[PDB]
Design an enzyme around this catalytic site. Structure first.
Site, PDB file in Angstrom:
ATOM      1  NE  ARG A  33       1.394  -4.717   3.882  1.00  0.00           N
ATOM      2  CZ  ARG A  33       0.345  -4.147   4.454  1.00  0.00           C
ATOM      3  NH1 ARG A  33      -0.497  -4.841   5.198  1.00  0.00           N
ATOM      4  NH2 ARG A  33       0.134  -2.848   4.274  1.00  0.00           N
ATOM      5  CG  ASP A  65      17.299 -13.505  -5.653  1.00  0.00           C
ATOM      6  OD1 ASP A  65      17.442 -14.508  -4.915  1.00  0.00           O
ATOM      7  OD2 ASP A  65      17.021 -13.587  -6.873  1.00  0.00           O
ATOM      8  CD  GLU A 120      -5.557  -8.848   3.271  1.00  0.00           C
ATOM      9  OE1 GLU A 120      -6.501  -8.375   2.608  1.00  0.00           O
ATOM     10  OE2 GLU A 120      -4.363  -8.563   3.042  1.00  0.00           O
ATOM     11  CG  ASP A 128      -7.717  -5.350   3.699  1.00  0.00           C
ATOM     12  OD1 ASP A 128      -8.488  -4.749   2.916  1.00  0.00           O
ATOM     13  OD2 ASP A 128      -6.473  -5.353   3.556  1.00  0.00           O
ATOM     14  CG  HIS A 130      -2.123  -0.933   1.040  1.00  0.00           C
ATOM     15  ND1 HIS A 130      -3.168  -0.682   0.178  1.00  0.00           N
ATOM     16  CD2 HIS A 130      -2.400  -2.119   1.633  1.00  0.00           C
ATOM     17  CE1 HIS A 130      -4.039  -1.671   0.243  1.00  0.00           C
ATOM     18  NE2 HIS A 130      -3.600  -2.553   1.124  1.00  0.00           N
TER      19      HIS A 130
END
Lengths: 253, 253, 253, 253, 253, 253
Positions: B72, B86, B151, B177, B47
């Site tokens: 996230r 990575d 969520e 959410d 977000h």
């Protein structure tokens, strides 16, 4: 349709203008500051990691909001000022102004000849909106606002001459540098420094110019507003964020 | 010398870890946060306007500080998890986890064969410090910490089975959410949502896993900590700055 | 104070909206276009080298000006749409929409749950001005404008069903993709392609939805306006610049 | 194999060079211009929002094409010129050259010792291709091309002295700055300015040097070529793009 | 004037092409490698921190030099492939190709309709030089070069079918992933892996396609060239840099 | 807790410090070097395309590792030095220091008043960690380390005076510029240059100051260490990479 410099307007009005110092040096972090409701925002090119292009990005982020942008160049260099003017800046806060003669040159730096020595390249730049603004050359000087920083003993000695210079709309007192110059580095609250600031504010106002200052201390900022400062900065974004974060962390540790 | 995951460690201990949400998406704005004393920082790729290179920039900035980085991703895609591993991320907060089968796939995505399906390309990336880490291929899985976001109302129903997936170290409860999914959009204080959240926290703990939540409300965060959450975020950097800025301006306007 | 989607407003009005395609993929090059006087500007994420962060910079540059921004994602991916919405985009042009079910999913993609699947993270995002907008969550759905691209044979077959989808405000016809789909690659002027476009515009309009198209050809753009198109893009910033520059060089060589 | 400066060579040959001014300040926007067919491209570091890193990006985008890059620094500062030289620029257009002494300093600034004062750090820089170029130190001076701008009353008075300096390959006349200097700000068409320009061109040519100018007016540029100008810029990329876009909008609004 | 794919040209000649792996993810760091003398350079979009904009900068940096660029996307995604083709990449190395059906889909993704599903928007893209290349749509397919990576057991079993796919120009063997897939993670030297690789190379060549591999080990790379590999990468820039730097430090510590 | 300058510490100890020159100008390319094991790393702002913001990014990348960062500005300009000090640099290598008067001024540029002329703006700067460092103003001077480059005949004549300046911790010999100044451009091995260098190291040491030098030649670097140099740079990152790549390529072509 040349953009009107609202900050310059309000300087001559009775009401003071509340400002915020922006040192995060990012267009995204800056758009948040534009939403807070300040009358003016200072993009710091002297003590924050800003360059021409990031200042350009912040100018774009700030434009929709009411707060007026002020840019502080790292020094009062003619070439640097010229670049800041071309990206669209109309108010400049120039540091380390020590003499009236230095201030007179700064006024010429922001003026097109005959009045000044500002180079003509407006058609290529954002300041004229790439030659969209009609008659930019004949009226650009009218919307420039020059603010000079007095922050050492020699500038304080020449305060009356510097404030007197025609074209100097405002005189900004930097308590951090002035305090250190007076032998109280890190202690701007000291009465000797406070007396100098209070005396400086008075001398600037009797010359007909606006007096400006920055205080993260809010009660101290209130004192400067009570004494008649036309533009006052009441906070620093990096400091406000850094303090808020550590106190929030401290509450849970 | 494979980097040890301290966040994963503290999870197994009895101490909770206080966290901060990072949505300023700038390595410089992110280094202030790293200086504030938190146990973990949440680089938000769902977000906040982050991408692979901005997340790398923020990982370089946080590394010298005690706080542990958690990333996230915008979604539990395999190619994306691969690219985050990575660049060096060892703790992930995967959003929109609705089923144990789904969490099973995510465990495989962070593990090398034969235990998983993670691609062998570490030697040329930061995770192995460009093949400086000895036997990184034989030990990397042990330092990966997978956190799943429940969520919605499917994940809540399937929470007991998600928490029981081996390799799921922690289950995170997104009240925003979850509130929307329950028909209380913008209304997480509603007792129907608080009842779900507490029940969710108790069920995760009984599964022997770590229960996590974000709450910018400090009374609510304190409750989540008293209920036994192992990792609690107590703020969002964008909100603290946006808040601090607009309250400061109001004290003068 | 929620931002009103003026593009969506005028779509329901009688007047057609004139647009320009932005492929320069830079905030500075984009601000020139914002100064040009177009009703809407298309930030192209499909065929131009744009990412989320560069689209964000262009939205900031465009914001002061009247033209309304439309972002075209590279594909109608749910997570990508959530990111574009959070950085502040209110009008989206989703390419390669082939079926009503796909268009139905795109409507859920721009709506908050329960009704839709848009992830909730408004406090952290520019869309709410970092929670400056009061009750942003309860009214955000009202200001989203979803436009779908029909650009191949299957989308054409299901055109009547696609336009019927509730929440599909406009249907955009892509002549370049449609021409190649029909066996006339590089020849959208071909009568078989032209016959379909005129038929397509009529079917969209009888469904009550807005019809949109892009034509660099100015006479062809007038014909599309004559047929009742609500939004027409009349140029591409890269084509105009590349063509002006080489024509200027040809005059002197 | 040291890079040969074809702009410098063609200046010594009979042929005039057609140029375009680049103020978009982006490698991507610059590569379009490289496709236009110009003899030379002016990367403007004085009036466009360019820094060292953006000029380097534009040089890399430009290299595959025939057009030769010319860089105009913000000022003729020795340290800046040194940085521009190290990133690979071989032709410089230095503004505000007012005196022969200053012109000599610029000639030495582009020369390695003993001949000049250019700092030695080539192994580290693109100019030598990171020491791929054999005996770069012994032949680099040969491919440097120094161009000086005469743009004010003092520079005009010293024009014969400036053109006489050895190593000044060309003298560029700035109609905008010179017109303002002569009391005709914004009115370069005035016969006084035009007479001053044509006299200056004649003297530059009788000094054996190349005379250069910028004219967006195409008929005026042809006259300058007809008068014997070696390098003439016939357009500005920001001006052409801005003009095409608003005129295109006007056709539809 | 359509850009010719010289990598594809040399692939169809008898001589092998020596390559270097590029993982530094910066246009400046990439220009050094272009100066090194390699036939091809692999911009790694799978395991290096590269995005679309950074791959574009590296393509611009490499263009003047002889080495040909090959781009490896993070996955064989259609939307991603379209964006990579538009920025001008003509040769792609697609990872995780397991079956002929998948390889046939990859061929269509790089072909314009009717033959393929590549989206048409070239007028806006670098691939056509912003519509400077005449009839680009009619010849772009001819210059596309698609290479597929076989790196797991399913890909090995279907190796003959994959290599047979029309439009699959070359088959690339990834020894690290294949070795891990075969139960020898971190042990590509094991004879079972080497026997599978040499057999795989033979099968690819008997199908008439180019066989490719990456070997940092120089003696092993010589064997692969002697066995008939058309394109062999003999080093990784990050490994070469990291190894040289640490050894130099060890000589003095 | 003000960060202690460990580079300055080891200078006063008996032990010499081995350094590497960084000209790649990227935070990611810089972190590879941070992993190599050097005592100090030189971020070159004079001959590499580095600006303030790219130098700040490299400092963030460098910080987790042991090697101590040294920054060389493009010139010893006071305003530039202030900017480098604020982003957190504690060791500066100033080029072209010719006289004791110039060195005394550089000492003032890095000291807060009364002792110096460094601007006070630390609350906004990384040097104090945005005012997290307690009483930074009272101890900032204590951790600054000033190194001066003597690189021409005038500096060599005043070398004993320059080294005598209080606050000049070390004197750095630049063989490349000194070589060219002495008439042996590109030939630092020439006995006249080598005799001057060896004499200089002795005179610097008799003043009690650290003697420093850069030699890519390893046997030459060993002699400089054997002669008593406190800090010796044994390589250039761009040179090592450029050499490894072209030598690897030559082995296969």
């Amino acid at each position: 349709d040349l953009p009107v410099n609202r900050f310059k307007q309000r300087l001559r009005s009775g009401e003071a203008q509340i400002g915020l110092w922006l040192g995060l040096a990012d267009p995204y972090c800056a758009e948040l500051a534009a939403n807070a409701g300040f009358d003016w925002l200072l993009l710091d090119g002297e003590h924050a990691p800003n360059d021409l292009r990031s200042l350009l990005g912040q100018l774009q982020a700030l434009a929709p909001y009411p707060g007026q942008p002020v840019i502080r160049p790292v020094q009062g260099d003619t070439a640097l000022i010229k670049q800041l003017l071309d990206i669209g800046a109309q108010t400049l806060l120039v540091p380390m102004v020590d003499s009236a003669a230095q201030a007179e040159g700064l006024v010429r730096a922001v003026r097109y000849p005959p009045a000044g020595v500002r180079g003509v390249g407006s058609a290529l730049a954002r300041a004229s909106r790439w030659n969209s603004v009609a008659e930019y050359l004949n009226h650009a000087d009218e919307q420039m606002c020059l603010l000079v920083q007095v922050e050492n003993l020699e500038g304080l000695a020449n305060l009356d001459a510097i404030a007197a210079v025609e074209g100097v709309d405002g005189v900004f007192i930097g308590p951090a540098d002035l305090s250190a110059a007076m032998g109280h580095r890190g202690n701007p609250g000291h009465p000797e420094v406070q007396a100098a600031i209070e005396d400086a504010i008075h001398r600037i106002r009797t010359a007909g110019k606006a007096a400006g200052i920055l205080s993260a201390d809010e009660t101290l900022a209130r004192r400067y507003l009570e004494l008649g400062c036309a533009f006052v900065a009441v906070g620093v974004d990096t400091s406000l964020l850094m303090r808020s974060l550590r106190e929030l962390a401290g509450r849970f540790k």
